């Protein structure tokens, strides 16, 4: 269960995971993920499906992996050819990014499962209900935003950047590859240059970090608070540092560092601070 699966791409952060017993159990959502809290336009979807060539389930009177099943929220509404399966999936996604199909909310998740030898059981399982995990990707045919869920994502060719878009393949592209990272992983500068598990220990530090808890501290009464008074804004930051406003609650400070073994007390895990610097108030906390 702890195995990191590729399905989570765009949904859960591959690095926001605690280290230890909880590892793999406590996932963290991507910073660009949304959660369905409602359901819509299920009422018009049968009408348009009927227009697209779906045979009414009372009338089809046939069933099998040899045929595509159109279902909505576990309401099987009809049957088509697998070819019409693909025609419907693509033309439907077109009317989703369009604004012309009011019975068709942008956020409907269109599960196409093509026919596959011993593959996933075929079908076109649409979903619009609650608690769906949904994330934006850029739909190229309309050069406009499209919401994709984890079910349909498996079978969708999403180029990671526009220059890597392969011809006749990627139907969407990532808006930004940061869209696959969680908040903390985007908050770590150049986190894409370190060994992953050191990035995860970075998440554990920022998560376990003594910082600025608030400014209403004169109106809270915690059993404990740690408030660093000498707070600064990193010189080096992600632009999401501003976009998520972590500058409101700075948790550290920009320090003059020498990368040097010299004193002989600087080994393995021990680092030296300037004494006069602390005397000037360096890292003073309460």
């Amino acid at each position: 269960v702890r195995k990191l699966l590729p399905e989570s791409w765009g949904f859960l952060c591959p690095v926001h995971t605690p280290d230890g017993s909880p590892c793999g159990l406590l996932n963290h959502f991507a910073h660009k993920c949304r959660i369905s809290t409602q359901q819509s336009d299920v009422s018009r979807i049968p009408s348009i499906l009927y227009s697209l060539g779906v045979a009414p389930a009372s009338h089809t009177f046939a069933a099998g992996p040899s045929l595509c099943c159109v279902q909505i929220d576990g309401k099987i509404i009809g049957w088509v050819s697998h070819e019409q399966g693909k025609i419907i999936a693509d033309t439907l996604r077109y009317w989703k990014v369009e604004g012309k199909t009011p019975g068709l909310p942008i956020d409907l998740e269109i599960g196409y499962v093509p026919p596959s030898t011993r593959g996933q059981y075929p079908g076109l399982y649409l979903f619009g209900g609650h608690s769906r995990m949904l994330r934006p990707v850029r739909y190229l045919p309309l050069d406009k935003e499209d919401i994709v869920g984890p079910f349909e994502q498996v079978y969708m060719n999403i180029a990671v950047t526009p220059q890597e878009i392969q011809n006749n393949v990627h139907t969407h592209v990532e808006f930004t590859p940061t869209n696959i990272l969680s908040i903390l992983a985007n908050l770590t500068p150049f986190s894409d240059f370190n060994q992953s598990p050191r990035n995860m220990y970075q998440c554990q530090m920022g998560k376990q970090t003594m910082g600025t808890p608030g400014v209403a501290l004169c109106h809270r009464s915690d059993n404990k608070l740690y408030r660093l008074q000498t707070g600064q804004t990193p010189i080096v930051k992600a632009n999401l540092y501003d976009d998520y406003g972590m500058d409101n609650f700075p948790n550290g400070f920009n320090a003059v560092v020498a990368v040097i073994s010299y004193t002989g007390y600087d080994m393995d895990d021990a680092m030296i601070i300037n004494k006069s610097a602390d005397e000037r108030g360096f890292g003073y906390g309460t």
């Binding site: 530090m205 970090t209 003594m210 660093l228 400070f253 560092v257 890292g283």
Partner: protein, 57 residues
């Protein structure tokens, strides 16, 4: 650089005398309780390894 709240520096503890549980009369638990660290089974065995039987007693 960020200062972690875990000033495990603050976690220092020393006990040369303290309370004991009445059901054992053995050192109680916890730094804030002036409790006494446990010499567990592995530390007992390990001290037998050293031959330090007068230290183990």
């Amino acid at each position: 650089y960020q200062r972690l709240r875990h000033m495990v520096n603050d976690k220092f503890q020393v006990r040369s005398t303290g309370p004991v549980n009445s059901l054992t009369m053995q050192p109680v638990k916890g730094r804030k309780r002036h409790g006494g660290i446990r010499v567990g089974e592995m530390e007992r065995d390990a001290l037998i390894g050293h031959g330090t039987s007068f230290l183990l007693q």
